[PDB]
Amino acid sequence: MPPAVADAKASGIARFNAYTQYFPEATLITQPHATGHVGNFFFTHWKDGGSAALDLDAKGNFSVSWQGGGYNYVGGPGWHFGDKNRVIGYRFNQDSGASYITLYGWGYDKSMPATDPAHLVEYYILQRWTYDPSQDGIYGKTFVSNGIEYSTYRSIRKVKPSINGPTTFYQYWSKPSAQQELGKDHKIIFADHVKAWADTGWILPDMNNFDASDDPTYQVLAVEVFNPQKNGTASGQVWDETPR
């Protein structure tokens, strides 16, 4: 078995009802809520309605195809856990106009009180977008990572779905000053974004645990659509290029 699959199994990822299985080759995911592995690649896939399909191969090539409608979908491939030193590489090939093409993940500290919205955090490092989340959050700071300027925001989700079920939680955002181009390799140096959030006191709770009720504290390269007004597709390839 691929090593991340073996590691996830040996740490009890099957405890989650929504975790499907290891698929050795490539699979199409269309259900409302699923996680799993295709090859060594973890995936998440979640929507509150509508129709959206994640096609993922064992080399990390993927496509999300969505149908127009009033719903929210987010999904994509990566890792069953966040690592603050990971360097995510990707190339995005096609984008009909997703709401976000974004690094996407969660942290969760079961020992923190749920009255503190920092006990559970959904985080985003946008790369392409047709919805601007700045309007929903407070500004943190601007910084440079891999030669480009990102700006941070913190928003709150009040009684909303999460990896721990309905919860009030913070979202941390990092948005670059320009859309990232298709057809070229890009890097997300995750440590720079973790650092930038921490620089304004926005601490990520633990990103390497299966303590939440519904899903791991995963980290993926995701396509998200909010109320898409047309059918669309978005496709790319993700990998780990962390210096090791």
Ligand X SMILES: O[C@@H]1[C@@H](O)[C@H](O[C@@H]2CO[C@@H](O)[C@H](O)[C@H]2O)OC[C@H]1O
| Angle at alpha carbon of residue 80, lines to 71 and 166, rounded to 5° | 45
For the chain, list the strands marked E by DSSP: 19-23, 26-29, 33-38, 41-47, 52-57, 61-66, 72-79, 87-95, 100-108, 120-129, 138-145, 148-160, 167-176, 185-189, 219-226, 232-240
Q: Is 122 a catalytic residue?
A: yes
4: its two tokens: 């991340």
Residue 27 in contact with ligand X, rule: CB under 6 A: no
Cβ distance to ligand X smaller for residue 46 or 150: 46
Binding mask 59-98 for ligand X (x = CB under 6 A): -------------x-x------------------------
Cβ of residue 154: shortest distance to ligand X, in angstroms?
13
3-state SS assignment for residue 231: coil
Residue from 93, 110, 161, 233 binding ligand X (CB under 6 A): 161
Residue 20 in contact with ligand X, rule: CB under 6 A: no
Quick one: which segment of 7-15, 79-87, 154-162, 228-236 binds ligand X (CB under 6 A)? 154-162
Cβ distance to ligand X smaller for residue 85 or 227: 227
Distance CA(191)–CA(84), nearest Å, equals 5
Residue 230 in contact with ligand X, rule: CB under 6 A: no
Distance CA(228)–CA(67), nearest Å, equals 7
Residue from 80, 214, 217, 238 binding ligand X (CB under 6 A): 214
Residue from 54, 163, 207, 223 binding ligand X (CB under 6 A): 163
Residue 211 in contact with ligand X, rule: CB under 6 A: no
Cβ distance to ligand X smaller for residue 65 or 145: 65
Q: Is 181 a catalytic residue?
A: no
Distance CA(232)–CA(10), nearest Å, equals 38
Catalytic choice (25, 149, 181, 224): 224
Distance CA(156)–CA(168), nearest Å, equals 7
Element holding 9 (H helix, E strand): helix 3-10
End-to-end CA distance of the chain: 22
Residue 33 in contact with ligand X, rule: CB under 6 A: yes
Q: Contact positions toward ligand X, by CB under 6 A?
A: 33, 44, 46, 72, 74, 122, 157, 160-163, 214-215
- Catalytic residue positions, numbered: 122, 224
